[PDB]
Amino acid sequence: PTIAHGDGRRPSKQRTFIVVKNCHKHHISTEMELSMLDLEILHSIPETP
Amino acid sequence: EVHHEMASIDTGLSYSSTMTPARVAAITTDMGIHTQDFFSVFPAEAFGN
């Protein structure tokens, strides 16, 4: 922005400058250990109580 | 160019503001031992020899 100076009468519009900045990217990886027989139970939905 | 005019008048019959020095930010002069040189301010003087 700019301050309106009336004393010097040196009028100036806003000085819009442009810089550029890098976007860092990060990549985290964990593993989930699901057992086999529990997934076999989870696939075959039963009806018996 | 937008010209803005306004007019001020102190309604207080006495002073109504105060300007107290509160904090030294920095001391600009080095506060050192630097004597000014009289052979620089008076370079047109000398002795008889």
**Residues 6 or more apart in contact with residue A12 via CB below 8 angstroms:** A2
**Residue B4 neighbours by CB under 8 Å, 6+ apart:** A4, A6
Q: Please give the backbone phi and psi of residue A8, each rounded to the nearest 5 degrees, phi first.
A: -85, -20
Contact B1 A11 (CB under 8 A): yes
Indicate which technique resolved this structure.
cryo-EM
* Residue with token string 């160019």: B1
Q: Which residues of B touch A6 (CB under 8 A)?
A: 3-4
Separation of alpha carbons A35 and A43, rounded Å: 13
Q: Measured between CA atoms, how close is B10 to chain A, in angstroms?
A: 21
Separation between Cα atoms, residue B43 and residue B49, nearest integer Å: 15
